[PDB]
Design a binder for this molecule. Sequence first.
Ligand SMILES: Nc1ncnc2c1ncn2[C@@H]1O[C@H](CSCC[C@H](N)C(=O)O)[C@@H](O)[C@H]1O
Ligand SMILES: Nc1ncnc2c1ncn2[C@@H]1O[C@H](CSCC[C@H](N)C(=O)O)[C@@H](O)[C@H]1O
Ligand SMILES: [Mg+2]
Ligand SMILES: [Mg+2]
Lengths: 291, 291, 189, 186
Amino acid sequence: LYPAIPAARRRPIRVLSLFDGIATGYLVLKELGIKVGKYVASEVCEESIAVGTVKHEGNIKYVNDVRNITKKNIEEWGPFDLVIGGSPCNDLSNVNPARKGLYEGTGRLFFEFYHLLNYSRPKEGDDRPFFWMFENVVAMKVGDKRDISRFLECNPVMIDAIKVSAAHRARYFWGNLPGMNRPVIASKNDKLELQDCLEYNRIAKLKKVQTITTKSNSIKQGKNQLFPVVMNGKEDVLWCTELERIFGFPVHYTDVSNMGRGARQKLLGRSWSVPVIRHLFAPLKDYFACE
Amino acid sequence: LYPAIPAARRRPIRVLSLFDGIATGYLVLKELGIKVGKYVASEVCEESIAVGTVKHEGNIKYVNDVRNITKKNIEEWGPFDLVIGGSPCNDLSNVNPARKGLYEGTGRLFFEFYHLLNYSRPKEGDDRPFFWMFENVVAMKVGDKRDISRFLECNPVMIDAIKVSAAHRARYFWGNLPGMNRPVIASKNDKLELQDCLEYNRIAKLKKVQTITTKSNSIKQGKNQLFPVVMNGKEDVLWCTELERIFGFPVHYTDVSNMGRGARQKLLGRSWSVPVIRHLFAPLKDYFACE
Amino acid sequence: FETVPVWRRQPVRVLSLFEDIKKELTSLGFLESGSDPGQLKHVVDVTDTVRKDVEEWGPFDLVYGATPPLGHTCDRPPSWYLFQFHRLLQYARPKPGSPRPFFWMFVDNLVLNKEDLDVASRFLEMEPVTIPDVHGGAVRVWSNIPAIRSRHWALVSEEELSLLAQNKQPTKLVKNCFLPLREYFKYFS
Amino acid sequence: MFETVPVWRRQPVRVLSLFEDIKKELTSLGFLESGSDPGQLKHVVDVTDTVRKDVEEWGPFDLVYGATPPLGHTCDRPPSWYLFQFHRLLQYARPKPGSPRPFFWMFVDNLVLNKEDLDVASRFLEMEPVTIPDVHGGAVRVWSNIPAIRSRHWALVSEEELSLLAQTKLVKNCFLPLREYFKYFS
DNA sequence: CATGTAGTCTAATTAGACTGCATGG
DNA sequence: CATGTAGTCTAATTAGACTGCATGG
Ligand SMILES: Nc1ncnc2c1ncn2[C@@H]1O[C@H](CSCC[C@H](N)C(=O)O)[C@@H](O)[C@H]1O
Ligand SMILES: Nc1ncnc2c1ncn2[C@@H]1O[C@H](CSCC[C@H](N)C(=O)O)[C@@H](O)[C@H]1O
Ligand SMILES: [Mg+2]
Ligand SMILES: [Mg+2]
């Protein structure tokens, strides 16, 4: 679709990340070798911001609550080459019995992504490259999946992290990135089964775990709520460093701000699967500078 | 006092570590470039054992409670070239107003070190090399320091971690290691000021902090109990990755077993200052195989 | 937007959303009596309308938005009418080099609460204006129409409008809101 | 292997009495002459400041005795202190590995060591204690390497009886088996 | 017929002050 | 006068069942 760019005419990428979380988008782009010129992140969780500032050493400009970003800010902070974001799904996911849909609660924060996306879009007559991506859960109402597809004017592609990670994670992905519908392929450094993510002297009962949420009981597998690890002949839950390896994050990526077990699992449960985002951002290397 | 040994007759070191804790001794020896042929650790804390097994990938043989080690065990597991240990000081340090002294409570565990040391000592007529070391607090009754010196038949040299770390740690060191009374010198990799131990975007208020214990109030400095760090303009306590850098441990060394802020400070608070132990174990690499 | 001479004013091409204002615009003299092909189009449920639908319905000069006036028959959440009115508005806006005037307005009959209100101002880039008729002896309006943002209606106490809203449990008040559009388009009588 | 020694070769004892004086008790069995020769018995009440150089210069020892205070309540020190100090000097008094002569040691307890202190004592002294009844013919625990104090069958009494009893002729009969190894005096 | 980028409720748990004093500065 | 390889409490705080049902398998 978008015309190819000669290698010398490429310039560092300028990213606007809404609902940035623990800076998964920046981590992926830096691991791909893409030179990042600017990364504006909209996040309100102090512990999440702490991870992004410490692990990336202040290369990320945090711009608090997304609802306070004005049209002037998009022009001042811009222009942007990439606009990514994953809206909170605590009011959209089927796992919540009291979810409030897309138009109430935290589900309406999706329209903030739709709002600032049109602000960031190049004006009529600007044929410069521009990409965007939006991620959310699969387990949402058909009425919410329909309306989200209408505001973004495109249909999502479902990518499960089961193909590149050791965990179930089925997620929709709206966007216009190159080759999103392409077959997902596993990498050489992808830890595909649970035993690859565990520490020394720990045995994995299963090869692939169920979807990890912010709650500690999503670690207990199956209907009988089985502990997924055996250590020294005793059953045990997953460790924080093991949850990171499952998601593809670097080890000790959430060892920030004196966070404990429940705190680190809360940030990881919301996050993206790193090798899945790498699969989506991979064809961006032929449009921006490298290092 | 011991003659020098040529490089060819040097064999890997065999260590018996009583009250091993988080395996500071094995970490120091392996960080000096010494081949560790055998490292027998006597530890009863599950989280402490978990640190040693995971961070060292099972090169340490854990031999539970020291009071259950028999004379036949020392002969089977031996011979030992080095016997190190630091007994619990919760009944010896002045910080506890209810300490029971050396002959009651947990102070009795010192004699367990004295007992197994005699078992480990080479019989007369065996001029082979043999070294030992015992660490404890300086804030003990002079009657306790006296009696400890009588059973070990040696006087302690006091080394404060203030010279090599960013914290005050005044400790006694009984032993027969080569050059224990030599002047303590600072290395190039030693982080001497608190600012060298903090993360990005964090500011230190002091250059040195007071003695770190298992309590979270030893982080609050001074008689007014002031927070030692400022980030984003607000005050904050030290982080677990920062406590590790203060003690000289590798970063994320205690990021195991889903341990929180309190558990990691408990293990670090009663541990050894790594650069101090390196200063003591440094002249051992002229009697054993180098890596 | 400059003023247009009288011999050049084309008839309006309105798009009425959620509420039919054909009986209102015809009365004020904007639409034509004969029900020929051309005039406003009226849609109720836009959940399945795409950009191609709006574009092929002809270029529009006015895009109207309104919420049900205390209807109590809402299968839709209150904020749903605003977000959908936004999505279709950007489908109706022409090429950047606008030849002619392009107007839009959104009317709320005391349905959007405080939380929904600031969302409407952020997305429409404008704080609303209150037009009362309750005790002349009321609806909020977001609109880029100049004389609706220029002329100032009677100031209304906020503690009073919320008290008269639920104690009561839309055509003659916004008729003055449609008034200043006569200058830019044809006048029929 | 501490085999028996011919009678014409049995040198007199040289013992080390710690925390209690058993000279007046060892005299009665004729292990040492009443004539006050200097080297036969050494007695120290406070050990805190004694070093191996003191024990070695006090002449070699054939017997090392240990005893706790007998319910006298004159105890400035914890009950485990008497055991730990007794173990510290036994290694000072033990001779070179090659054994020229017999070496014996004994530690008795006058029911002042609780169960926690007992298993610590038997572990440092490398043997479980034997109990000698003296209170009710019609009692002390003894750790000792002397054979006939781990050989004969004394009155096997229970611990519930030892607990109720807590609420010198018998300890003189365990000094007797050292007579078949050293000089007899009358 | 097992599953889920969660919320409420309750019992464990744990984070913080309150304590404590011999002793070199 | 300030300091300390800590032990109590008490009070926040967290950690863990219970819930919940559309939906392809
Ligand atoms: N009003 C708001 N403005 C900006 N961020 C918000 C917000 N409300 C919620 N958020 C943040 O949006 C995030 C959505 S969870 C998604 C996190 C991110 N995609 C990741 O990879 O980790 C949450 O972390 C939440 O803290
Ligand atoms: N009875 C026992 N047997 C073996 N280890 C014991 C013990 N009682 C306590 N310990 C351990 O002895 C340790 C003393 S703290 C010293 C830790 C170690 N020197 C380090 O550098 O980290 C504690 O971790 C405690 O768990
Ligand atoms: Mg697509
Ligand atoms: Mg010395």
